[PDB]
Design an enzyme around this catalytic site. Structure first.
Site, short mmCIF file in Angstrom:
data_model
loop_
_atom_site.label_atom_id
_atom_site.label_comp_id
_atom_site.label_asym_id
_atom_site.label_seq_id
_atom_site.Cartn_x
_atom_site.Cartn_y
_atom_site.Cartn_z
N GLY A 159 46.80 36.54 52.15
CA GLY A 159 48.16 36.59 52.03
C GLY A 159 49.01 37.68 52.22
O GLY A 159 48.19 38.82 52.39
N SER A 160 50.08 37.62 52.55
CA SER A 160 51.06 38.99 52.61
C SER A 160 52.25 38.75 52.07
O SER A 160 52.95 37.79 51.33
CB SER A 160 51.43 38.99 54.14
N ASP B 8 54.34 44.12 34.70
CA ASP B 8 54.44 42.94 35.65
C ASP B 8 53.42 41.81 35.53
O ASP B 8 52.89 41.27 36.65
CB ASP B 8 54.40 43.45 37.28
N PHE C 33 53.34 42.48 47.29
CA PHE C 33 51.94 43.25 46.78
C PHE C 33 50.95 43.89 47.90
O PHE C 33 50.45 44.98 47.47
CB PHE C 33 51.01 42.04 46.24
N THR D 213 48.90 43.19 51.90
CA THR D 213 48.41 42.15 52.51
C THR D 213 46.74 42.10 52.38
O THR D 213 46.17 43.00 52.17
CB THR D 213 48.40 42.61 54.29
N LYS E 229 42.57 44.59 49.96
CA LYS E 229 44.25 44.95 50.03
C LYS E 229 44.65 46.25 50.85
O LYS E 229 44.16 47.39 50.74
CB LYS E 229 44.80 44.98 48.62
N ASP F 51 46.81 42.92 39.90
CA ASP F 51 48.07 43.87 40.43
C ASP F 51 48.56 44.77 39.22
O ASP F 51 49.67 44.70 38.46
CB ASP F 51 49.17 42.61 40.47
N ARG G 222 51.93 34.42 39.03
CA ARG G 222 51.66 34.98 40.55
C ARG G 222 50.60 36.07 40.28
O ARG G 222 49.95 36.31 41.55
CB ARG G 222 52.66 35.28 41.24
N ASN G 223 50.33 36.87 39.18
CA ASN G 223 49.51 37.86 39.33
C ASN G 223 48.27 37.36 38.13
O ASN G 223 47.64 38.60 37.71
CB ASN G 223 50.01 39.23 38.57
O1 LIG Z 1 41.39 37.51 45.68
C1 LIG Z 1 42.27 37.76 45.61
N1 LIG Z 1 43.43 37.38 46.47
C2 LIG Z 1 43.35 36.09 47.09
N2 LIG Z 1 42.50 35.25 46.89
C3 LIG Z 1 42.92 34.14 47.56
C4 LIG Z 1 42.23 32.81 47.72
C5 LIG Z 1 42.99 31.72 48.33
C6 LIG Z 1 44.15 31.99 48.71
C7 LIG Z 1 44.86 33.34 48.66
C8 LIG Z 1 44.28 34.33 47.94
N3 LIG Z 1 44.67 35.53 47.54
C9 LIG Z 1 46.00 36.11 47.85
C10 LIG Z 1 46.61 36.39 46.56
C11 LIG Z 1 47.62 37.69 46.78
C12 LIG Z 1 48.42 37.95 45.32
C13 LIG Z 1 47.94 38.23 44.09
O2 LIG Z 1 46.82 39.37 44.24
C14 LIG Z 1 46.86 40.60 44.07
C15 LIG Z 1 48.14 41.47 44.13
C16 LIG Z 1 48.34 42.85 43.98
C17 LIG Z 1 46.84 43.38 43.92
C18 LIG Z 1 45.74 42.73 43.75
C19 LIG Z 1 45.65 41.57 44.04
C20 LIG Z 1 44.35 40.78 44.16
C21 LIG Z 1 44.09 39.93 44.86
C22 LIG Z 1 42.63 39.22 45.05
C23 LIG Z 1 41.62 39.84 44.31
C24 LIG Z 1 42.13 40.80 43.33
N4 LIG Z 1 43.18 41.41 43.26
#
Ligand SMILES: O=C1Nc2nc3ccccc3n2CCCCCOc2ccccc2-c2cc1ccn2
Length: 300
Positions: free
Chosen positions: A26-27, A142, A30, A32, A52, A160, A146-147
């Site tokens: 995702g992008s 926050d 937060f 990418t 990230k 987040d 979504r977080n």
């Molecule tokens: O595994 C993480 N993401 C992630 N797995 C996914 C699986 C399938 C489809 C989409 C996915 N996403 C995207 C979600 C991004 C928005 C929320 O995530 C964050 C926002 C700010 C800071 C850190 C994180 C974050 C993300 C992941 C793990 C730890 N921290």
């Protein structure tokens, strides 16, 4: 020490060659996030990772490292931790992969298979994650659906820490009144946000105050309006949300009390959430008198 205790967390610097990006997950605001695999050279181990990057500037690099600071300093089953950072020209945060994505998207996508047991257990787990942050003198600032991320449907974690602090665009619709009017943020302002988060889940991912612009929200709350009772919520569950949205901060529940309340409800979910066709519902697994009773693990 005279003030706060020393933060002896280990910041782990990881080589670019130790891991590989597989695809973009995702992008947005937060950053990418990519899916990846981390393979520590010495060990016979492969670790799924979220990587990230921001979508570089000296300002961007400060903010992202402040976020890494906070993520490296937490350690709790319902809180996402930093595995390390990579110091290429673009600074990269390496985190644990949360395969099922964010809980907001999950509830929207799997509405027809989410039962009361899952909803209530999620509420408990978030309350535990937040209560841990409170124990660490740390205000999230926050918290929203979504977080909260989904490791498995049974296990969710808070993430987040971009706005996180010790005790631009802001999330007005998840913020306590005092935060909006006076920029005051406490653990009890996080409770307001938990309230909103719970409402998001119980409505299966509805936008709060949908159609209303953010500049009108402060006067609406001042006047006394709150988010409405979702169809599936008993008065018992809605009453808890309403307490999270009191004007008086100290009158709102503590996270430790929410853990207790939701865990009591989680023992008999159909008494507290009325969902048509409930517990005929299936979600993926890794393997794929008594009213006020509370297990000691929930009584902190
Ligand atoms: O595994 C993480 N993401 C992630 N797995 C996914 C699986 C399938 C489809 C989409 C996915 N996403 C995207 C979600 C991004 C928005 C929320 O995530 C964050 C926002 C700010 C800071 C850190 C994180 C974050 C993300 C992941 C793990 C730890 N921290």
């Amino acid at each position: 020490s005279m003030g706060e205790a020393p933060n002896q967390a280990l910041l782990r610097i990881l080589k670019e060659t130790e891991f590989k990006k597989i695809k973009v997950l995702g992008s947005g605001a937060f950053g990418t996030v990519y899916k990846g695999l981390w393979i520590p050279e010495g060990e016979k181990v492969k670790i799924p990772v979220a990587i990230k990057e921001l979508r570089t500037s000296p300002k961007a690099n400060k903010e992202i490292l402040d976020e890494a600071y906070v993520m490296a300093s937490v350690d709790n089953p319902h809180v996402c931790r930093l595995l390390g950072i990579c110091l290429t020209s673009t600074v990269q945060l390496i985190m644990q992969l949360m395969p099922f994505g964010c809980l907001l998207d999950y509830v929207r996508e799997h509405k027809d298979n989410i039962g009361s047991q899952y909803l209530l257990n999620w509420c408990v787990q978030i309350a535990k994650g937040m209560n841990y942050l409170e124990d660490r003198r740390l205000v999230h600032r926050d918290l929203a659906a979504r977080n909260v991320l989904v490791k498995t449907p049974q296990h969710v974690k808070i993430t987040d820490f971009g706005r996180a602090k010790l005790l631009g665009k802001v999330p007005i619709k998840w913020m306590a009144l005092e935060s909006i009017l006076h920029r005051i943020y406490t653990h009890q302002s996080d409770v307001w946000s938990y309230g909103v988060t719970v409402w998001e889940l119980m409505t299966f991912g509805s936008k709060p105050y949908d159609g209303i612009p953010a500049s009108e929200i402060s006067s609406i709350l001042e006047k006394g309006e709150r988010l409405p009772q979702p169809p599936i919520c008993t008065i018992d569950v809605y009453m808890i949300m309403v307490k999270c949205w009191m004007i008086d901060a100290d009158s709102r529940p503590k996270f430790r009390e929410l853990i207790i309340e939701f865990s009591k409800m989680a023992r008999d979910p159909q008494r507290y959430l009325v969902i048509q066709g409930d517990e005929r519902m299936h979600l993926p697994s890794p393997t794929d008198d008594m009213d006020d009773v509370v297990d000691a693990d929930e009584y902190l």
